[PDB]
Structures are given as structure tokens and as C-alpha cells.
Design a protein around this ligand. Structure first.
Ligand SMILES: O=C(O)CNC(=O)C(=O)O
Ligand SMILES: [Mg+2]
Ligand code: NI
Ligand SMILES: [Zn+2]
Length: 331
């Protein structure tokens, strides 16, 4: 069995290997990359996502989210308070202000220490989940706006034609902005490209050990667990590496820098934080190996998780027994 310790793997495809996206994902899995839940892909030196980032300041962040924490430093939840719209230029200036800017630090490890020590005492503002793309239309390789759609994959594998679309999302981050512990909708893959700015640190649990994380989360968040049998779908809970280690939960960590891709694999729980002003683009995707994970994915039916139009068909076709209850949650 390849990669039996479930380490995060890093890949350096050549320009020729960068042509066929599906084939390269399958290659990475042949080497055991999925066992980690997360992989890094460094694009060939010949590749670029677009020519420059000099003209992005007029993008609108219609609903910036202030991430307010409650709990203790290593075990907390966050809720998202909606703020007034602002442009990317206005948000960059805010991120760089004395109130929000990254503190002086020695290296990524020192910054990680400061994040876990101090995150709860601040409420950074995240421009998340903005439909759109920063890939140039002429970029033909690993262009996250030109991937094969999940609806087309389900159709190719299973023969059923379904409604729905699949488009990318932009994330504008600042110091301390945080992504809570989650897997993707319907335990899909994700791919995330860091277009510009400061790094993003990731934590991940191997898919084969995801239920260990879930059992810890039920212990640590006991009211939330009683409210919903899949409350990590709410995407609000944080657990630090120190707490994970104290409870024996297998995980790994890695820092993504500008110009690098990350792939999350089906049922790979992940969480993380931004180091400073940055912009990422991400989208979900599927492969033939996903289908069995989609059929077994948990679902939130309490009403909190509320998701896209396109998840309807996935539930309806892959999980017909759950469909009625899940849809009641959506309405
Ligand atoms: O970058 C972020 O805030 C969150 N991204 C992801 O969870 C992902 O790409 O799957
Ligand atoms: Mg602009
Ligand atoms: Ni994710
Ligand atoms: Zn729920």
C-alpha cells in the first residue's frame, strides 16, 4: 500500500504532465497521495495563472464576514457577522492596517504559535465565497474555471443526467482569518489555488481516520452534537493541533504559498488560517473514486448547513433514502 503513514505529498509536474488534469490526479492517487487527505502541487516553472494581479482592486466583496470566536484558545467556535460591502482595494487596506496586520514574527512556526495563542481575542474580516475566477481565459492547464463538471462526471459514471452547475469561488483573507474543520459538500474533492499574497496554513486528518475526529468533536462540542448529527457541516468548529495531539487524533499540517495548488481528497477533514492579506480560488470536483464517498456522505438536516442548488441532485440520486429529510432541512 502506497503512503501507509498518510503523509502529505508534494508534487512537481512537468509542463507535459500538466496537460491532462484527470490523469495527474489519478497519478497522485497511484502514489498514495489521497491517504493524507491533502496534497500540494507546485506548477511547472513555465506556467502562469494570469499575467499580473495589478488590476483586481475593483472586485466587490458584497458581504465581508467578521469571524467572531467563542470558547478557549484551542477549542472554539466562530460565527460570521455580516459587514458592509467593500472593494478588494478597500479590504487590502483594512488587512494592512495596524488593527488587522500580521504581527512581527520569526518564521511560519512562530506565526502558528501566535495564531493558536491569540486568535480568539480578535475578529478578523474574511471575503469568502465570492463567485468568480482570476484565471486568464487563455490559461489552458489547471484553470479552475475550465474543469470538467461534477454533473458531467456523475453522468459519465452512472448514466443519469442532472441539473446543476459547478463554478469557482474567490477568497480574500487577512491575518487570522480561519476555515473551520470540515469535509467538502457530499465529501467531494476540492482544489485551491493561492493567487497572491501571504501564505495559508492547513491541517488535515487522513480520510481513513475521519471518524476519530468526529468523535472528538462530539465530546468537545456537546450541545452542538445534540442539535445535529453532522454538525461539522456547519463549518464553525476549531480544534488546535495541541488539542488534537492530546487526544491522539492523527493529522498533518502544511503551509501553502502563493503560486501553489492544494487538493483535498474525499472525506479529508481540513482546517486552517491565513497569514496576512491573500487571495485564493477554489472549486469542488469529482473523479470515479468519489462516487462511493458521495453515497456515504453524512448530511446536516437541522437547517443550519444550507448549501447550493446543485447539491440537490447529488442527494437525490446518490442518497434517495435521505433525500426527503435533507430537503426539509433546506426549506
Ligand atoms: O481557503 C479557505 O478559506 C477554505 N478552502 C477550503 O476549504 C478548500 O479549498 O477546500
Ligand atoms: Mg478590478
Ligand atoms: Ni474545504
Ligand atoms: Zn445541522
Amino acid at each position: 500500500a502506497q503512503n501507509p503513514n498518510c503523509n502529505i505529498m508534494i508534487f512537481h509536474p512537468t509542463k507535459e504532465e500538466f496537460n491532462d488534469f484527470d490523469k495527474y490526479i489519478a497519478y497522485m492517487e497511484s502514489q498514495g497521495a489521497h491517504r493524507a487527505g491533502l496534497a500540494k502541487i507546485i506548477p511547472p516553472k513555465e506556467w502562469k495563472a494570469r499575467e499580473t494581479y495589478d488590476n483586481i482592486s475593483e472586485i466587490l466583496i458584497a458581504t465581508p464576514l467578521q469571524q467572531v470566536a467563542s470558547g478557549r484558545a484551542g477549542v472554539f467556535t466562530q460565527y460570521h457577522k455580516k459587514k458592509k460591502a467593500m472593494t478588494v482595494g478597500e479590504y487590502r487596506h483594512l488587512a494592512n492596517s495596524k488593527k488587522y496586520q500580521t504581527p512581527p514574527h520569526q518564521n511560519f512556526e512562530d506565526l502558528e504559535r501566535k495564531y493558536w495563542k491569540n486568535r480568539i481575542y480578535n475578529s478578523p474580516i474574511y471575503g469568502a465565497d465570492i463567485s468568480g475566477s482570476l484565471f486568464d481565459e487563455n490559461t489552458k492547464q489547471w484553470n479552475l474555471g475550465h474543469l470538467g463538471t461534477i454533473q458531467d462526471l456523475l453522468e459519465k459514471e452512472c448514466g443519469v443526467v442532472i441539473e446543476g452547475v459547478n463554478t469557482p469561488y474567490l477568497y480574500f483573507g487577512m491575518w487570522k482569518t480561519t476555515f473551520a474543520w470540515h469535509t467538502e459538500d457530499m465529501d467531494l474533492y476540492s482544489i485551491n489555488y493561492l493567487h497572491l499574497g501571504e501564505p495559508k496554513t492547513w491541517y488535515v486528518v487522513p480520510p481513513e481516520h475521519g471518524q476519530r475526529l468526529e468523535r472528538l468533536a462530539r465530546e468537545l462540542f456537546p450541545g452542538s452534537s445534540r442539535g445535529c448529527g453532522a454538525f461539522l457541516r456547519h463549518k464553525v468548529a476549531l480544534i488546535s493541533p495541541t488539542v488534537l495531539k492530546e487526544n491522539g487524533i492523527p493529522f498533518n499540517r502544511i503551509t501553502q504559498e502563493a503560486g501553489e495548488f492544494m487538493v483535498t481528497f474525499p472525506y479529508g477533514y481540513h482546517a486552517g488560517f491565513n497569514h496576512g492579506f491573500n487571495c485564493a480560488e477554489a472549486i469542488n470536483f469529482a473523479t470515479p473514486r468519489w462516487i462511493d464517498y458521495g453515497k456515504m456522505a453524512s448530511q446536516c438536516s437541522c437547517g443550519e448547513a444550507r448549501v447550493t442548488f446543485s447539491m440537490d441532485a447529488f442527494v437525490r440520486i446518490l442518497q434517495p433514502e435521505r433525500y426527503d429529510l435533507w430537503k426539509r432541512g433546506q426549506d
